[PDB]
Design a binder for this molecule. Structure first.
Ligand SMILES: CN1CCN(c2cc(-c3ccncc3)c(-c3ccccc3)nn2)CC1
Ligand SMILES: Fc1ccc(-c2n[nH]cc2-c2ccncc2)cc1
Length: 334
């Protein structure tokens, strides 16, 4: 076992191995506190996240287990992965805190889009990396569900990683509460992200769920006959069909000046009918990315056992299962 040292950083206390030095808080939220640190063993700057109230309830306990299982499974250049996971606890009884460690990512796409106006070549590279990580994630039967600029970490090399796998980036089927949305919800988010990088403006800055939908339908037009035929909720259908019908706009006109290849990709990404959205694997082959697309270098993920998501367990079982995952963690080769 390693040796730990203790310090209070912004109200929260931190107990971590000596190997992690010069802890410096980077931001907080409902997820937990994150500190930047220097890792003496590897020589790398790392981010250390302390989970907040990881076993407060069954929801929190399952969530803590899900995140650890999820992060332990991601080994991909464009997805946040685990360098280390630890707890100061020596036994299961005293297990109450979980610490996650990954390569420090200095910025996100919000501090890059609002602070600049991306050139078409930088858009190609950034979006290509997103789709490359999304192919890997989707190959594991995982849906991100919450893709947005602040969930895409970027460093100075413009290397990008997905993390955390009104919402201006949410697919309309979710705005409408369709219970069977598929992985193409993530593609819709990518489309909204790409559009923002090209124009510097939020594509759909809705103020609520209703306003969000009107903004979407203003651009992509109201659902056609084939799409309405797939809506079971009578309420949702009645609403939709009762709106002042609107036509699909010419994307080449909305995104005037942009690269015609980028516009064609947006049209295939921002399709209302989810059965017809381009998939991540298909987008990677789109001509827009011809400069970066390497089919032998866009790998898929090993199988991911999600059977736990339907289990109804007590807090101590979720806690014990999490402890099992901390103890059994094997770091990645240096
Ligand atoms: C929208 N917000 C959602 C929450 N978030 C983060 C960002 C980071 C992070 C910070 C810096 N470098 C890398 C990752 C981490 C994190 C995950 C595992 C280990 C350590 C840290 N967890 N959550 C910030 C963006
Ligand atoms: F106005 C809209 C906006 C989006 C959709 C939609 N796109 N993909 C799936 C759906 C959908 C929505 C509600 N119920 C079933 C399916 C349907 C109508």
């Amino acid at each position: 076992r390693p040796t730990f040292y203790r310090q209070e950083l912004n109200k929260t206390i931190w107990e971590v191995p000596e190997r992690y030095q010069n802890l410096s808080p980077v931001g907080s939220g409902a997820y937990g506190s994150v500190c930047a640190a220097f890792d003496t063993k590897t020589g790398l700057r790392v981010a250390v996240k302390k989970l907040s109230r990881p076993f407060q309830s069954i929801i929190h306990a399952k969530r803590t287990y899900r995140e650890l299982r999820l992060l332990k499974h991601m080994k991909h250049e464009n997805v946040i992965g685990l360098l280390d996971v630890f707890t100061p606890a020596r036994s299961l009884e005293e297990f109450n805190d979980v610490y996650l460690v990954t390569h420090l990512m200095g910025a996100d796409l919000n501090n890059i889009v609002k602070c600049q106006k991306l050139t078409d070549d930088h858009v190609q590279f950034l979006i290509y990396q997103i789709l490359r990580g999304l192919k890997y994630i989707h190959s594991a039967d995982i849906i991100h569900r919450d893709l947005k600029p602040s969930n895409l970490a970027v460093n100075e090399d413009c290397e990008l990683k997905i993390l955390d796998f009104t919402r201006w980036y949410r697919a309309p089927e979710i705005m409408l509460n369709w219970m069977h949305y598929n992985q193409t919800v993530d593609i819709w988010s990518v489309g909204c992200i790409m559009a923002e990088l090209l124009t510097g403006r939020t594509l759909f800055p809705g103020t609520d769920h209703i306003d969000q939908l009107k903004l979407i339908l203003r651009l992509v037009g109201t659902p056609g006959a084939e799409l309405l035929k797939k809506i079971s909720s009578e309420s949702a259908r009645n609403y939709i069909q009762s709106l002042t019908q609107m036509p699909k706009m010419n994307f080449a006109n909305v995104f005037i000046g942009a690269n015609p290849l980028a516009v064609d990709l947006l049209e295939k990404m921002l399709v209302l009918d989810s059965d017809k959205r381009i998939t991540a694997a298909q987008a990677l082959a789109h001509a827009y990315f011809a400069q970066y697309h390497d089919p032998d270098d866009e790998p898929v993920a090993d199988p991911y056992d999600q059977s736990f998501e339907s289990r109804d367990l007590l807090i101590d079982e979720w806690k014990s299962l999490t402890y099992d995952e901390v103890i059994s963690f094997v770091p990645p080769p240096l």
